[PDB]
Curated annotation (Swiss-Prot):
Catalytic residues as annotated in Swiss-Prot or TrEMBL: D177 (for rdrp/tntase activity)
Localization of this protein: Host mitochondrion outer membrane
Full protein segment contained here: 446 to 861 of 998
Biological role: RNA-dependent RNA polymerase, which replicates the viral genome composed of 2 RNA segments, RNA1 and RNA2. Does not need an exogenous primer. Also possesses a terminal nucleotidyl transferase (TNTase) activity. The TNTase catalyzes the addition of nucleotide to the 3'-end of plus- and minus-stranded RNAs, probably to repair the 3'-end nucleotide loss. Forms the open necked connection to the cytosol of the virus-induced replication vesicles. Mediates viral RNA1 recruitment.
Region (Homomultimerization): 185-285
Entry text on domains: The N-terminus is important for both membrane association and mitochondrial localization. It may also contain a RNA methyltransferase (MTase-GTase) capping domain. The C-terminus contains the RNA-dependent RNA polymerase domain and a structurally disordered region at the very end.
Species name: Flock house virus (FHV)
UniProt miscellaneous comment: The viral bipartite genome is composed of RNA1 and RNA2.
Protein name according to UniProt: RNA-directed RNA polymerase
Amino acid sequence: VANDKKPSDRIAKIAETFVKLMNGPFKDLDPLSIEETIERLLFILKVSRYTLAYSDIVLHAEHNEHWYYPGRNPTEIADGVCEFVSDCDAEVIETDFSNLDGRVSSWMQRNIAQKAMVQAFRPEYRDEIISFMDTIINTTPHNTQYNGCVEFTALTFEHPDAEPEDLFRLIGPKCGDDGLSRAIIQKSINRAAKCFGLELKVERYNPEIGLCFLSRVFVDPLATTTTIQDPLRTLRKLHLTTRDPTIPLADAACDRVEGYLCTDALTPLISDYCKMVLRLYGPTASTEQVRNQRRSRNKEHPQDAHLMKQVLIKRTAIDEDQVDALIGRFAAM
């Protein structure tokens, strides 16, 4: 659903200041060769060749590590999240956007992303990048840029008397559709989204139900960095498999449970399901080398185990006796 909601006059100066702060000290850049882009990490290649270099140079710089979390290993993500929650003393807010790529306006697209790319890249490459942006208007970096712009707008609205550089220095971790911010702008974020024309969903941090971030649940971010898959999103749908019909059910289930072990080995109410899938569909599945040579293969802390159990129960609103009964039923099947 395309939208053409231009922002107000005042917000334009805030957006320009945010873009300039994003530019930082990297005035000049050069495009990457086709071979280097191909070995990095059709239609994706032509934009990737420039966008990967732009991200790696500007968005992964010294003065842009405060907010651009997108682009780091999951261990690095967990470390950053724990550091941010320690800094904010467990006072953080979560942002959940609905169809951001389908809702970003033309003015935002042509005044944030296009401006940033043109300022980052060399003048001799202006035509190619502008043509690529025009083709885009009619991937990953766009969401991060939108999140950074919205964070800058919120910070500018919260403290209009501070210098833009100091305001932007407080930008918290942001990664695409998910991000973190101070809880003091919980109500003012909705007005900023309305001014830009975006829809924002915000939820106050609650230790009883855990914290939601990148479909990951932090059981107790104050002390431990233990983290698990989001139970709210996956439990209601994990019993149904959305793989293509051509794949046997056993191979898809095996890949799903292998990923779950790789990410959620010691999570209550999921380990039992994964083990029962491995016990039932496991022997009936095909050879694992066969599925490793098949395209659809990629189409999918012990100390606080008690606390993780209680946090999962709080997340799923299931009584402990009910949880034990469910665990017994799952294991005995």
